[PDB]
Symmetry: D2
Subunit: 470 residues, 4 copies
C-alpha cells in the first residue's frame, strides 16, 4: 500500500532546518545581521532565550476564548494556571495592590492594546487627545491630516493633538490645559514614543479631572524603566496604563492593559459611593469585542519576561540603560550636537542634526549602510515633515548586550563619523538636492570604499559582544 | 567589584527550564493534557514542529513597520526576504494569478484580519451582513442584541445577520437576497465557524452585485480544505478572502487578507475601465491604520506552514479530514443522532442532542470530564440560547495525529458513552433542572467512579497516537 | 430738509396691493387657480379665514426662545398665554389626560417635528423602521438607496423599511415582526402618507415592546380624522405622536409632538418604578437642540385651528370626508378601476391605473392640464419606480368646500374622462413610448382642443363652490 | 333637515375676532405691549404691513414640494412664479452675479438654514468651528459642554469653538488660525449674534483655505446692514452665506442660503478646471433631505421684504441704525459704562455692567419690569456663565419706529435710571446674594412704587411713536 501517511507524520515532527531551509536561512541570516550591528533603534531589544523557548510551544495549540472562570470550551485548566499566573506577575512587577489594579494580558500587540481601551471607555466618535505624531507621539494616540484620517484611532474616534513647545522641547502643558476646555476630551493619552524626558502625570491628571476625561498612560516605551523604578511611575496618577511587553521589557511582541478597580467617587453626604467599572468595560472590549482566541504562547513569554523583570539583574540593567543614555547624550553634546530638550531622563535621545548641517533622512540611510541602525524623527520646530532633521537613538537594545558608558562613547564616535560621511555625500549633491540623488550617490562607487571602511570598524566592534537567544 | 553583570548576561541565555520552572511546568503539563485527550473542538489542531521552531526565533526582535519597499527604519532586508517569500507562498497555495490577487500577511490573528477589511472597504457605520452567531457565524461577522452592540464589528459598523433555514439547516439564501434589498449591505460575509456544508459563493456574489456590496469570504475554518481542493474555493467568486493561518492550516496563530487586484468595471463604450483599488485600501488599514510592528516571528511560522500545506502529504491529510468527518457523522447518524443538515461537506458536524433527549450544555461538561473536549453550539430551531442542544465536533485536530475512519468510529462510540452518562446525571436532577445542580451532581461522588471508568478508556486510546511538536 | 423719513414710515404701513403689486398679483392669481380647480391632492386643504388672520399678525415680531417658564428674554407674557393655551387645546382635541400626555407646539413644520423626535429618543445612528416610501411612507420615515442616503432621517440615523404585502395591499406586519428581530429597531414609525386603511397600532406596539423600541405614530395625514373620531386613535398604543397641523386639520403649516409622561415600568418587587422621561428629551431636542425662535404667529393659527377642530361642524366635516372618500372609491370601483386594498377606511384612496392600461405618470400630467390636480404614486407590486401606475386622490380638500357624495360621483366621472384622454394620447405615442414624447403630444395641437373641452367643464363645476379665505 | 353644513361653511369664513376671541385678545394684547415698550432686544424688529398681509394668504394652501422645474405634483405654476421671483430679488439685494451665486429660499427659519448647510457640505461628524456661545456666537454654530452635546450642530457634527480675546474684546484670529491646524475644520462659521464689530472675512477665508475648509457666513444679524452697504459684505470672501429673513431685514420668520456656483479650482497645467457643486448639495439637503412642503406663504413675505430692502428708504433706515447705535453707545460711554470692544461698527453693543457694579441678570429683569426689554449676555472675561455681567442692546427695533440720535440719548438715560434701581435692589439684598431673592425684592412693595414711576415715564415716551402693522 502507498503509505506516505507515516511520512506525513514525519513532516509534522521534521525540524525547521529540514522542513524549510529557505526560512531557516532567512532566520540565521537575520541572527547574524543582528550580531554585527550597533542597534540604536529606540524601540528595539533582544528577547531572552527563556522567552523565545516559551514562545514556540504546545501552548500555541489551545484555543481558550474568554477569561479564567469565563472560558467557553472545556480544556482551559492549564491555560488558566498561566493567564492568572501572568497577570499576577504583572501586578507585582509594578507593585500594585490587586484590590486597586486589574490587568488584562490578552492584547495581541501594543496598538491592539491601546485601541481596546478607547473602544471600552470612549465609544465611537468620543474625543481623544494625544501627543502629536511629529512631536513624539505614537500613531495610535491619534493622527489625521486635512485630507484623510490615517490612524484607526482617528478614524473611529475624534482626536486632536497637543504639541511640544518648540522653544523648550518639552510638552506644552499650559496649552493642553487650555485647548482641552475647547475640545472637551473624553480620554487624555499620557504616553510617548520619542520623548527624552519625564511626563508630568501629576499635571495631566489635573487637566483630565478638570475636563471629566480618563487619563491613560502609554508606557510601552518605558515599561522596563518604570518597573525598575529608574523613572517615576504613571500608576499613582492614571486611570489606565497600556504597555507593550517588548521594547524596554525585553519580552515577546504582546501588550497589556492595567486598569484601576475599587472606589472612584466620594459623595460625602450621599453615604454610598461610586466604583471604578473599568474591569468589565476593558475586558469586554478585548473579548468578545475586538479579539478572539488569545495567543497563549505569547502570554507564556510575557509571563517569563515579567519574572525576568522582577529580578535584581533586571533592575541594574535598566539603571545602565539610563546611564548609557546620558553617557551617549553627553558625548554628542560635547561634540557640538543639539540634543533636543538638552538631554534625557529615560533610555532615548532626539538629536537635532541641524546643528551639524544635515537632516535625519540622509543621515539615517548612511548609518544603516554602515551597520548602525536607527530612525529619523521630526524635531520640535521642524519646517517640513518631509526633511526631518532628527535622529532617535536609544540604549536599551545595545546595553542589553553588555555595552557600558565607556563603550557607548565609542558608539557616539562611530555615529559622528557617519554624519561626517552624510555631510560629504551631501556636499557633492549640494545644489542638486534630492533624496533620490543622495540615496544614489551613497550607493555609488566613490563612497562605496569610505562606507565599507567605517562599516568594517563598526561590525568588528559589535561582534565583540553577545546576542541573547541563539 | 560586584559583578552580577556577567550574571545578567547568563539570565538572557538561561533556558526556560531553569529561568522559570513555573511556566516550564505549565507547558509540560499542557503538552501532556493534549496527548491524553481526544480533541474534537472543530477549530483546534496541532502545529508542526517546523512551525514551532520558526515561531520563537531572533525574528522576534526586528521591528519592521510598513511593507517591503515601504519600511521606515533601516534593517528590513531579511525581514523583507521573508514577508515577500511568505505572501508569495500564499498566492501559490491557492493557485492565484499574482496579477489578479494580492495578499497581506501582517494581521495579528483572525479577528484582526476581518476587522481590517471592514475598516478599509466599509468605513464607520457602513452596513455589513454576516451569518447569525447562533446559526453558525463568527463573532466578527456581526453580533448585537436589543440592548448592546457586542462585537466590535457591530459597534463601529451597522450589522444585520441573515439566518439559516431551521427546517433544512442550510443558509436561507432566498431570504438573504430579499432582506439585502431592505438593508443595503456594503459588504456581505461569506464565511462560517460552525456550518456542516458548502457555501453558495456563486449565489452570494450575485446577491452582493445586485446590492452593490463587496463579497468577502472568511475561510478561516476551511483554509486547509480549500488549499487541498477538498472543498470548492471561494476565490473565483469573492472580492476579498480573510483567513486564519491556524485551524485547518496547522500554522501558528496569525491571519491573512487576500484581495483581488486588476480590472473591476467594463465600460463597453467608455474605452478606459475601472480597476480594483483593494490593494491600497486594505494595506493602508492594516498599517498605518490598525496595527504596528508586524510579528515577523509569526510570519515565519505562517511561511513554513504554507510550504507544508502545498505538499502532497498535506493534500491527503485534508482528504482524510473530510473522510474521517463523514465516517464519524455516519456512525452517529446510524446510532440515532440527528446530524444538523444531514451530514457535512467539510471537516465538522453539528449534532443536535435533542434526538437523544439532552442538550450540549450538559453534554459538553461531562465529555470534558472524560478527556474528550468539544464545545456546545445552538442548533437551527433552538428555543433558547441558554440551553443550546448542539455539539460541534471536528476531525482536523485528531486526524492530524493519525486517526482513521476505523479509529473515528471508536471515537464516536466513546462520545455516545459520554451522552449515556449525561442522560443519567440528567435523570437524577430531573425535576430539579439547573445547570449549577447538574454541574455539581457530576463532580459528586456517585458518578466520579463512572466518569473515571470512561476516562481511563478514552485516555488509554488517545495515548496510542503521536502529538506533533514535543 | 430731505424728509423721506416720514415716507419710510409710510412704506412699513403701506398695504400689499401698493407696496408690491407683483406678489399681490401672484397671490390673487393663485387664489383664482384654487377656486377653479378640483383639488384631489390627498395632503391639501383650505385654511380657515380665522387661521389666516392670526397667521399674519404682530405675533410675528416677538422672539420667544425657550418655553413658558423657561423663556430667556423679558417680554414673553402674552406669548406665554398663547403657547400654553395652544398646547392646552391640543391635549383636549384628542382627549388626553394632561397628566399622561404632554405636547410641544413649536416644531416649524411636519418633517421638523419628526426629526426632533429621532434626535431626542434615538440619538445618532440609532436604528429606525418606517413604512417604505413606495409602499406609502413619508420621506422622513427613512429613505435610502444602494448608492446614497437621501432623507435626513437616513443620513444621521440608520433606517430600514418594512413593506406592504403586494398580494393584499396591507402592511405586512408578520414580516415586520420578523425582520425587527434582525435589525433591532430603536423606534418604529406607525404612520403613512398614502395608505388607504387603518394601522394596527395595537400590533405595532407589541412588535416594538418585543424589541425594546419606542413606537411613534405620524398621524399627520389623519390628524383631522383621529380628532373627530372617524378613525381609531393611535394615542392608546403609541409612546409619541407627531402630527402636521395642516392637511386634515385645516390649520397653517406647522407641527406638534405628543409625548406620554407619567409612569413607564412596573417593578412588582422593587417598589418604586420608572417614569417616562419623554417630556424633557423631546423639548430639549426642539430647543436648544434643533430650532430657534418659535414662530409665535404660526402657533396662533394652530391654536385657532385646534379650537375649530373641537367644534361640532368639524366633527361632521370629517365624517363627510370618509363618506365622500368611499362614495368616490365606490364609483371608480364600479367603473372597473382597481382601488388598492379594495377601498379606504380614511380620506384617501390609491387607484392602480394598470386596470385601465395606463400609469399615474402620464395620467397625472393630463388631469393637471384639465384643472383637476393630484399626484402619481407607486402601487403595491409596481415593477419600476419610474413608471408609477397609481394615483392618490383624497377628499379633504374638495369636501372642505362643500362637495357631497352626489358631487364626488361627478368628480369621479370627470376623472375617468381624464383617463380616457390619457389612453388616447398614449395610443398615439404607442410604440414610441417616452414620457417626454407623451408630455409633448398632450401640449400639441391635436389634443389641445379636447383637453380644453374637458377643462371648461371641470372648471365650470369647481367654480360653483366656495373657497375659504378670500 | 339638520343643516349645520351651511354653518360649517360660515366657520371657515368667520373672522378671527368672532371665531376665537381668546387668541384675538392675546394678539391685541401683545400689539399693545409692543407699542408701549422700548424694544432694545438686538434681534427684534417690526415687520412691514405689506409683509404681514402676504404672510396670511391663500398661498398657505398649496403644497409645492421640490423646486421650480422639479416640482412633484401639478399646480406649481404660480408658486413657481413666486419662488423664482423671490430668489431673483435676493440675488439683487446683495448685488450678486446670478452666474456666480445661487440662492435657496425654502429654509423654515434661521437655524434650519444653517443646519441644512452642514448636512450638505460637512456630512455627519465632520468638524465645524464657530464663535463660542458666551463670546457672541449663535447656538447653531456649535455648543457643547463636558457632559452633553447641546446644540444639534454639536450632536450630529463635531464642533470646537474659537474665542474672543478678553483683553481686547475682538475675535482672536491668531489663535483660531493656530488651533484650526490641530482640529482640521471642514467648515468655519463667520457669523455672530452678539458682536459689536466687523468680521475679518478676508482673514477667515485665508484660515479656511489653509485648512481646506468651507467658509460660511451667518449674516442673520446684519443682513439688513450688509444689504444697505452700511457694513462690509461677506459675499466677496465666503463660499456660503446663511441668513435670517427677519432681524435687520424686517421680514417674516424664514431663512435663505446663498451658495457660490461657477468655477472653484485653477489647474494651470491641467487645462480643464473644477466647479463649485454647492448648488446641488445645498438644494438636496433642504429637500428631499431635511424639509418637506415649503412655506409658500412665508416666501411671499420674504419676497416683499426683499423688495422693501432694495428701496432708498431702507438704505437710510439702516444708516440710522448704525448712527443710533453709536449715538447710544457714546451716551453710555460718556456716563461711565464699559462698552465691550469700545463701541460698535453695526446695530448692537454689549455693555459690561461690571463698570457700574451689577450684572446683566439682575439688570435685565428690572428693565423688563420697566417696559424696556433686552437680554443678558456674557462678557469677554466673565468669571461664570451663571452671573452674566453684560446686556446686549440694539437699535434696529426701536429705530424702525422713528427714533433718532436725539431720541436714543433719552433711551440711554432711561436705561441708566433702570440700572440705578438694580443697584438699589442689589444693595438691600447685599450680603444675602441670590437671584431668587433679588427677583422677589423687586416684585416686593418697597420698589413697586419706584419701578412704576420709571415705567410710567418710559411708556409715555414709547407711546409717542408708530408701530408698523396694526
Ligand atoms: C509608544 C508606543 N505605543 C504603542 C506601540 C504599539 O506598537 P506595536 O503594535 O508594534 O506593539 C508602540 C510601538 C509604541 O512605541
Ligand atoms: C470562522 C472564524 N473567523 C475568524 C476567526 C478569528 O479568530 P482568532 O482571532 O482567534 O484567529 C476564527 C476564530 C474563526 O473560526
Ligand atoms: C405623513 C406625513 N408626515 C410628515 C409630513 C411633513 O411634511 P411637511 O414638512 O410639509 O409638514 C407630511 C408631508 C406627511 O404627509
Ligand atoms: C446669528 C443668528 N443665527 C441664526 C439664527 C436663527 O434663529 P431662528 O431659527 O429663530 O431664525 C439667529 C437667531 C441668529 O441671531
Amino acid at each position: 500500500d502507498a503509505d506516505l501517511w507515516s511520512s506525513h507524520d514525519k513532516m509534522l515532527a521534521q525540524p525547521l532546518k529540514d522542513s524549510d531551509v529557505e526560512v531557516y536561512n532567512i532566520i540565521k541570516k537575520e541572527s547574524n545581521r543582528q550580531r554585527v550591528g550597533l542597534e540604536l533603534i529606540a524601540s528595539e531589544n533582544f528577547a531572552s532565550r527563556a522567552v523565545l523557548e516559551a514562545l514556540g510551544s504546545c501552548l500555541n495549540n489551545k484555543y481558550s476564548e474568554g477569561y479564567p472562570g469565563q472560558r467557553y470550551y472545556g480544556g482551559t485548566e492549564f491555560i488558566d494556571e498561566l493567564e492568572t499566573l501572568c497577570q499576577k506577575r504583572a501586578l507585582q512587577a509594578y507593585k500594585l495592590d490587586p484590590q486597586c489594579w486589574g490587568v488584562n494580558v490578552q492584547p495581541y500587540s501594543g496598538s491592539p492594546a491601546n485601541f481596546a481601551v478607547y473602544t471600552a471607555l470612549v465609544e465611537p466618535h468620543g474625543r481623544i487627545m494625544g501627543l502629536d505624531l511629529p512631536d513624539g507621539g505614537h500613531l495610535t494616540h491619534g493622527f489625521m491630516t486635512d485630507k484623510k484620517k490615517i490612524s484607526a484611532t482617528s478614524i473611529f474616534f475624534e482626536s486632536m493633538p497637543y504639541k511640544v513647545n518648540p522653544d523648550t522641547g518639552y510638552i506644552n502643558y499650559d496649552q493642553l490645559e487650555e485647548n482641552a476646555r475647547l475640545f472637551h476630551p473624553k480620554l487624555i493619552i499620557a504616553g510617548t514614543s520619542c520623548y527624552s524626558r519625564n511626563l508630568e502625570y501629576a499635571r495631566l491628571r489635573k487637566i483630565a479631572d478638570e475636563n471629566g476625561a480618563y487619563l491613560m498612560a502609554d508606557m510601552a516605551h518605558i515599561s522596563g524603566l518604570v518597573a525598575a523604578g529608574v523613572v517615576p511611575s504613571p500608576f499613582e496618577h492614571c486611570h489606565v496604563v497600556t504597555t507593550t511587553t517588548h521594547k524596554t521589557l525585553r519580552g515577546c511582541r504582546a501588550g497589556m492593559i492595567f486598569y484601576r478597580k475599587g472606589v472612584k467617587s466620594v459623595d460625602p453626604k450621599t453615604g454610598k459611593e461610586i466604583l471604578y467599572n473599568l474591569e468589565s468595560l476593558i475586558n469586554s472590549a478585548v473579548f468578545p469585542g475586538l479579539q478572539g482566541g488569545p495567543h497563549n504562547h505569547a502570554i507564556a513569554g510575557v509571563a517569563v519576561a515579567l519574572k525576568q523583570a522582577m529580578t535584581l539583574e533586571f533592575k541594574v540593567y535598566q539603571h545602565q540603560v539610563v546611564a548609557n543614555c546620558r553617557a551617549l547624550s553627553e558625548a554628542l553634546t560635547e561634540l557640538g550636537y543639539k540634543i533636543v530638550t538638552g538631554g534625557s531622563d529615560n533610555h532615548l535621545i532626539l538629536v537635532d542634526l541641524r546643528s551639524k548641517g544635515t537632516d535625519g533622512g540622509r543621515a539615517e540611510k548612511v548609518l544603516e549602510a554602515c551597520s548602525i541602525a536607527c530612525n529619523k524623527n521630526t524635531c520640535p520646530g521642524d519646517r517640513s515633515a518631509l526633511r526631518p532633521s532628527g535622529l532617535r537613538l536609544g540604549t536599551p537594545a545595545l546595553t542589553s548586550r553588555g555595552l557600558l558608558e565607556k563603550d557607548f562613547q565609542k558608539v557616539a564616535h562611530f555615529i559622528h563619523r557617519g554624519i561626517e560621511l552624510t555631510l560629504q555625500i551631501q556636499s557633492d549633491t549640494g545644489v542638486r538636492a534630492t533624496l533620490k540623488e543622495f540615496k544614489e550617490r551613497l550607493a555609488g562607487d566613490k563612497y562605496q570604499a569610505a562606507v565599507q571602511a567605517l562599516r568594517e570598524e563598526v561590525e568588528s566592534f559589535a561582534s565583540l559582544f553577545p546576542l541573547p537567544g541563539l
